[PDB]
C-alpha cells in the first residue's frame, strides 16, 4: 500500500468546503471613517457577538461558523494580552494580530480535520492623539491576508455589498452618514436595530477605542 491521497484533490475540496460555509453565513462590513473604524454586521441574536475588542486600539470582526471564530477571538485576546504584558501595551499592533491569524488559519487549513469556515477582519485605529490612517486586514480560511485601504466585507454574498460600498464609500464620513451607507450596502446583499450589531473603534477614546452602539442611540443614529 504505497499509494497516497491526492494533495491537490484535498486542497480543492477543503477550499470549497470553506468557501460554502462562509458564503452561507451572515455578513459584516468594516470601513474607515473620521471617527476611526466602523463595524456593522447583520446579526439577529442578542447574545452572540461577531464584533469584538482584541486590545486597546485593535478590533475584531468575523463571519462564518461561530464556535470556530469565537475560538479565534479568544486566542487573539490571549496573544495580545500576553504580548502587552511581556513588553508594553504600546507594542501590541493590529499588524501582529493579523500576522498571527494568518499563521493559524494557514495551519488549521493544512492540518486540522475540517478547515475553518471563517473569514476575519482585524482593525486598528491610532492611539489617542496620534494621527494614523486606520488599518484593516482580512484573513482568509486559506490563511491568505489582505491589506484593505477603506473597507472590508465578509460573509455571505459579498460582490453586491462590495460594489455598493465601492460606489457609495465616502472618506472621513460622519459616523451617522457612514452607518447609513454601510446599512445601505448591507441591504444590497439582500435596517432594524433588532437586525444589527454595531460598534466602532474610537480614536477619540483615551485608551480603549472599542465601543458598542446599542438600542436607543443606535436607533437615533439610524
Amino acid at each position: 500500500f504505497p499509494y497516497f491521497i491526492s494533495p491537490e484533490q484535498a486542497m480543492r475540496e477543503r477550499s470549497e468546503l470553506a468557501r460554502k460555509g462562509i458564503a452561507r453565513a451572515k455578513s459584516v462590513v468594516a470601513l474607515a471613517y473620521a471617527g476611526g473604524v466602523l463595524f456593522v454586521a447583520e446579526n439577529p441574536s442578542r447574545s452572540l457577538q461577531k464584533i469584538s475588542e482584541l486590545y486597546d486600539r485593535v478590533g475584531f470582526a468575523a463571519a462564518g461558523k461561530f464556535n470556530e471564530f469565537d475560538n479565534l477571538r479568544r486566542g487573539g485576546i490571549q496573544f495580545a494580552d500576553t504580548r502587552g504584558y511581556a513588553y508594553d501595551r504600546r507594542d501590541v499592533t493590529g499588524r501582529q494580530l493579523a500576522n498571527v491569524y494568518a499563521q493559524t488559519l494557514g495551519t488549521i487549513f493544512t492540518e486540522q480535520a475540517k478547515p475553518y469556515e471563517v473569514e476575519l477582519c482585524v482593525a486598528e485605529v491610532a492611539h489617542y492623539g496620534e494621527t494614523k490612517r486606520p488599518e484593516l486586514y482580512r484573513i482568509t480560511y486559506d490563511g491568505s491576508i489582505a491589506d484593505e485601504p477603506h473597507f472590508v466585507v465578509m460573509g455571505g454574498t459579498t460582490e453586491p455589498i462590495a460594489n455598493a460600498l465601492k460606489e457609495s464609500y465616502a472618506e472621513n464620513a460622519s459616523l451617522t452618514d457612514a452607518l447609513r451607507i454601510a446599512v445601505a450596502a448591507l441591504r444590497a446583499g439582500s435596517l432594524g436595530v433588532a437586525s444589527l450589531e454595531v460598534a466602532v473603534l474610537d480614536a477619540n477614546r483615551p485608551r480603549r477605542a472599542f465601543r458598542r452602539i446599542t438600542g436607543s442611540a443606535l436607533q437615533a443614529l439610524l
Binding site: 469584538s52 485576546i77 494580552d81 500576553t82 502587552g84 504584558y85
Partner: protein, 248 residues
C-alpha cells in the same frame, strides 16, 4: 484543560517565566466614608537601614471601581498590581462582562496564595484591596476594603478602615481615634493622610511628606462615579495642615 478565562493560568502554562519571582517596607491605609472608599500609601523604599527609594508609587487603580496597594518588596508589589489589572480586563474582554466584586477578590487571593512559598523566602507581597461595588444595594455602603494574609485568606472589613505594611499598627491605632471624624470623602482623605503621617512618625521604614523635594503620599478615591487619582496638591495641602497643626 478547563478554561477559567484567567490570564494568570494561560500566562503560566504558555509563558510561566513571565510570572513574577531587597527593597521593602511600606504603609498602606484604606477607609470607608459614606458612598466612598479612599486608599493611600507612602513613597519610601528601604534596604536595611538605607533609603533606596523616595518616589515609589504603591497604590494603583486596577479597574474602574478598584485599586490595590501592596506592601512588601517593591519588585514583587509593582508587578503584582500590573498582572492583577490585566487579569481583570482579560476576563472582561473574553466574557464581555466584568467579574463580580466577590470574584475579583477570589482571583487576587489565588495570586497571593500561589506566592506563599516565595513569601517564606522574603518575596513577600501583602496586598490591600479597595473597591466600590455597584451591584451592592446601598451606595453609602458600597465601598469595600479587603485584606489578605500570606496564605491567601481574605477578609472584608466591617471595621471601616484597615492598613498593611511596616507602619500599619501605628496607622490603625491612629485611625481608631480619628475615624468618627470621617463624614465625607474630604474628611476621609484627611484622616487617611494623617494615619500615614502617624505611621511615618513611629516607623523609620515609612516615609512621611518630604517638603524639601515635595514628595507626598499618593491616594485614590473611589465612589459611584469610579476610581480617580487624588491630585498631589490636595494632598500636599492636607499634609501642611497636619504638620502645621502638630508644631502647634
Amino acid at each position: 484543560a478547563v478554561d477559567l478565562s484567567s490570564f494568570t493560568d494561560f500566562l503560566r502554562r504558555q509563558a510561566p517565566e513571565l510570572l513574577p519571582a531587597l527593597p521593602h517596607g511600606a504603609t498602606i491605609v484604606a477607609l470607608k466614608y459614606p458612598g466612598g472608599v479612599v486608599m493611600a500609601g507612602d513613597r519610601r523604599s528601604t534596604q536595611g537601614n538605607m533609603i533606596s527609594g523616595r518616589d515609589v508609587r504603591k497604590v494603583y487603580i486596577t479597574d474602574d471601581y478598584t485599586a490595590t496597594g501592596i506592601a512588601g518588596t517593591a519588585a514583587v508589589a509593582v508587578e503584582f498590581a500590573r498582572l492583577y489589572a490585566v487579569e481583570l480586563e482579560h476576563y472582561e474582554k473574553l466574557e464581555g462582562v466584568p467579574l463580580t466584586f466577590a470574584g475579583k477578590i477570589n482571583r487576587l487571593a489565588i495570586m497571593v496564595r500561589g506566592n506563599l512559598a516565595a513569601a517564606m523566602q522574603g518575596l513577600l507581597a501583602l496586598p490591600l484591596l479597595a473597591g466600590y461595588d455597584i451591584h451592592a444595594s446601598d451606595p453609602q455602603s458600597a465601598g469595600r476594603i479587603v485584606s489578605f494574609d500570606a496564605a491567601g485568606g481574605w477578609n472584608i472589613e466591617e471595621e471601616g478602615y484597615q492598613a498593611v505594611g511596616s507602619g500599619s499598627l501605628f496607622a490603625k491605632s491612629s485611625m481608631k481615634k480619628l475615624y468618627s471624624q470621617v463624614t465625607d470623602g474630604d474628611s476621609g482623605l484627611r484622616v487617611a493622610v494623617e494615619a500615614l503621617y502617624d505611621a511615618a512618625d513611629d516607623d523609620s521604614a515609612t516615609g512621611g511628606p518630604d517638603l524639601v523635594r515635595g514628595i507626598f503620599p499618593t491616594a485614590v478615591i473611589i465612589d459611584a462615579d469610579g476610581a480617580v487619582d487624588v491630585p498631589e496638591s490636595r494632598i500636599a495641602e492636607l499634609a501642611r495642615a497636619i504638620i502645621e497643626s502638630r508644631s502647634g
